[PDB]
């Protein structure tokens, strides 16, 4: 990382989402279980292969 960025938390390609808009997020996985958690948005849903 470089100054102004956060260690561990930084990615190379972000996810761009508009505001004031109803967005449907479909969470899934390919090999094992995961979980998509963003504590600012209050979203934490597990990524299950098949669901």
């Amino acid at each position: 990382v470089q100054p102004g960025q956060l260690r561990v938390l930084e990615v190379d390609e972000r996810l761009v989402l508009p505001t004031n808009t109803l967005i449907r997020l479909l969470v899934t996985a390919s090999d094992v279980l995961h979980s998509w958690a963003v504590p600012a948005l209050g979203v934490k849903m597990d990524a299950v292969p098949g669901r």
Binding site: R7, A37, P39, K44, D46, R51
Partner: protein, 504 residues
Amino acid sequence: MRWLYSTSHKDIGLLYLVFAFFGGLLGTSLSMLIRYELALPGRGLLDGNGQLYNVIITGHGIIMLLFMVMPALFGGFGNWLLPIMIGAPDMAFPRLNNISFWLNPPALALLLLSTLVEQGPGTGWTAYPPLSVQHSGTSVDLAILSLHLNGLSSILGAVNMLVTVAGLRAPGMKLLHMPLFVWAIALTAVLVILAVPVLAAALVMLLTDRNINTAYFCESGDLILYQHLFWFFGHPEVYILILPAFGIVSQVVSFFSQKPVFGLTGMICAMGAISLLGFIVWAHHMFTVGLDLDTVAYFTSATMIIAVPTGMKIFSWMATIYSGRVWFTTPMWFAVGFICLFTLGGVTGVVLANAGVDMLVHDTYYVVAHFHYVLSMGAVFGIFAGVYFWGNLITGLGYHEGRAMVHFWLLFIGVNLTFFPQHFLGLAGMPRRMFDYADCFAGWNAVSSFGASISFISVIVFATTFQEAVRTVPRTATTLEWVLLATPAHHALSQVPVLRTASS
């Protein structure tokens, strides 16, 4: 030959106590590597190995859950103290009691052998598929077979306990005159018999998925089914580990207050309500897996009900201390500490029950701080309260009171400074089961790793408390093990005591 072929309950209980001490030592050793990897940001002593960190946390959680608290409270104090407390001459099945103990060293050996095979079983203590199924090798099979052997041990022990309480009581003694430790052990046995075979079925399905190419939890299966079965087992499991602590705290608080237990039938009813509610609330561990909102709604509403019986038990203990003649000793401080610090472990459980709040703090260190309040400070304090209470009867050795107070204060300081900062980490969003964290989480991580070393030092200081005992003669007591000599005979209660009801 005495300690390999035993049929006496007092020897098997002491073997359980020693085996539980060994499991506590192994888990404390595994817990220092966790807090020493987590002291500073970056890569610590594990050289950036994540598989090894996962193996370490898996082994630590399984050992401290199953091979420390369970053999100490259920197998240890239960086997030694149950037939003396009810007046039974022995257990109902004395050779079944020995195979109850002797299936535990093969299970611990298989669990420790799984760490040295392939890359180990890095799965967590819950062992969720398909992470458990993806692991090539043999280690996961050894860990699950260790779980099977421990479960069969607990089932056989509960069978012996339940037939002993039902069918070998003293004449004149009904299910009203038994002390609360007996009630706690009996309800624990009921929970074990009802809950452990569900885990056995779930792990059989896991074995067939791993090795037989079946379709229980796979591409064409259902991965939420494993979490359903596992937590239907696993939430009664945490009340199995806490009810004997309630019984011990009742006995200790009653003794040194010079008073009987306040609200005896209320105590038994609260323990029974806790036992019954533990089987219908299990999906409070599954708020974020994608269940329908009605299921989440019910499990939120049902989980908050368990607070009322526990609050009655706590207020009844406080009323037992109320209006007494209290003498504060070392086991007394381990019970007052239980009452004051299990409350801090239960109030955060109320917060975790509400599924809206649980969307933020699931798989964070808020959960960890909660369940180390209710286990490292509810169950460990219960274990250590009875060691300084019944120790001269069980082992024959006295203890120095000053070094025991030193050990208590060291443990009390070291656990209030390890897990109290883990609340703030979890509220700010630090995830569980991770060894490298963000740069801003450094202060509370440093404080928690400072507390863990104080805990380790208190573990070391405990070995220096034992000394020689002074033996006296009994006349009268309120429980049947305080009229025995220390140590009692190999066949204690040479004549079976009877309870005579007076003309009143």
